[PDB]
Symmetry: C2
Subunit: 121 residues, 2 copies
């Protein structure tokens, strides 16, 4: 048995992201269509944060921020994130510590390369 499993071996590489200038309505539609509760917010491979369904509710809806408004005013971080060569068990423990279900994965240049979800484990 050669090695402990790395994030790269279990993450998804089919990346669905949303930009900071897109609307809360667009984020909510993407969450519904993809059946996910959290989206990576990026400009291209440049990771800004993760936006959750609960973030939309407690940071936007509760404050009267309407669906046409841009995501970027609602994003708050710093995001959890990991490197693709990190050990998956260590990352899983950090996800449970933050009570998150998806974590973005970057390469050594901090470019977004994947998403690790609890369901991948």
């Amino acid at each position: 048995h050669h090695h402990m499993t790395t994030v790269a071996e279990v993450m998804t590489r089919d990346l669905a992201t949303i930009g900071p200038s897109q609307s809360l309505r667009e984020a909510a539609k993407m969450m519904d269509d993809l059946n996910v509760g959290s989206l990576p917010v990026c400009d291209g491979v440049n990771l800004i944060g993760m936006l959750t369904d609960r973030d939309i509710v407690v940071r936007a809806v509760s404050a009267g921020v309407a669906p046409n408004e841009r995501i970027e005013g609602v994003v708050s971080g710093p995001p959890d994130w990991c490197y693709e060569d990190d050990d998956v068990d260590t990352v899983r423990k950090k996800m449970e510590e933050a009570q998150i279900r998806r974590v973005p994965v970057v390469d050594r240049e901090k470019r977004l390369v994947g998403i690790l979800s609890l369901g991948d484990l």
Copy 2:
């Protein structure tokens, strides 16, 4: 000895009615640190409105925060009686990935909320 739902549920009820706004629901979820709220019209338990429901049924449709929540909730809700076995109910909650279940008496009146 079997622990019943009544022994561990919260009896302090904070519910929302169908005529109240999405903003009010979201603010209650934040203030109470919960992901779902019982929707009640008087003694009539209609369903459990989740934070995700607000997003995928209201925000995704462009609904403004001041709009009422009526019709956003979908069901039927999971629910249990106060004298049900809590271990059984929690097994069902784990299976369905729900974190809160409304608890009713034999007349189907809301008496508590079970969390975990």
